Amino acid sequence: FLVHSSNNFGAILSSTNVGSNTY
Amino acid sequence: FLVHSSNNFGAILSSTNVGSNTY
Amino acid sequence: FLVHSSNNFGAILSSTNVGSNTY
Amino acid sequence: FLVHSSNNFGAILSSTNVGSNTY
Amino acid sequence: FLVHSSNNFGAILSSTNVGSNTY
Amino acid sequence: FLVHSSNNFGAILSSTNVGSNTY
Amino acid sequence: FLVHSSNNFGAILSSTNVGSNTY
Amino acid sequence: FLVHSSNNFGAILSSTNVGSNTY
Amino acid sequence: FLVHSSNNFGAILSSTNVGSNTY
Amino acid sequence: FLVHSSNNFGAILSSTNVGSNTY
Amino acid sequence: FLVHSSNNFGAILSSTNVGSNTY
Amino acid sequence: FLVHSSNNFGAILSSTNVGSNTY
Question: What is the DSSP string of L2-21?
């Protein structure tokens, strides 16, 4: 018997930069 | 019997920079 | 019988820089 | 019988820089 | 029977720099 | 029977620098 | 007069997971 | 007068997963 | 007159997990 | 007149976990 | 006239965990 | 006239845990 509940009521602003690597 | 509840009511601002490595 | 409850009501500002390493 | 409750009502500002290592 | 309760009502400002090592 | 309660009502400012070692 | 030279002769294996956040 | 030279002679294996967030 | 030279001849293995935060 | 030279000839293994915070 | 030279010939193993904070 | 030379020929093992704070 497993129960997983996730409730979100809030504003979420996200910025993600992955890279910009010089080889 | 397992119960996992996560409730979020707050604003979340996130910035993530992964990289910028010179090799 | 396991119960895990996480409630968040507060603003969260986060900044994460992982990298900028010169090799 | 295990109970883990975490309630957060406060503003959280975080800054994390991991790196900037010269090899 | 184990109970772990953590309640936070206060502002938390954190700064973390891990690195800046010259090899 | 184990009970662990931690309540925080105070502002917490933290600064952590781990590194800056020349090898 | 600015000169930026980056030469890489070594194998580079990288894994990056950004996310897996429950709101 | 600006000169930017990047030469790469090495194998580069990369894996990037951005996401898997439950809202 | 500025000169920045970075030469890498060594194997580099990196793993980065940013996230896994429950709100 | 500025000269910055970084030469790396050694294997570098790194693991970085930033997060896993419960709010 | 400024000269900064960093030469690394040794294996470097690093582990960094930043977080795991309960609020 | 400034000269900064850092040469490393030795194995370096490091472990860093920053956090695990209950608020």
Answer: EEEEEEE-S-EEEEEEEE--
Contact criterion met (CB < 8 Å) for B23 and A22:
yes
| CA K7 and chain centroid, separation | 14
Determine the distance in angstroms separating the CA of E15 from the nearest CA of chain F, rounded to an integer. 5
Contact status, residue B19 vs residue A21, Cβ threshold 8 Å: yes
Residue B3 is which amino acid? Answer: V
DSSP label at residue F22: B
Closest-CA residue of J relative to K4 is J4
Q: Rounded CA gap, C11 and D18, in Å?
A: 24
In angstroms, the CA A18 to CA H18 distance is 9
Task: Find how far residue A15's CA is from the centre of its chain.
Answer: 10
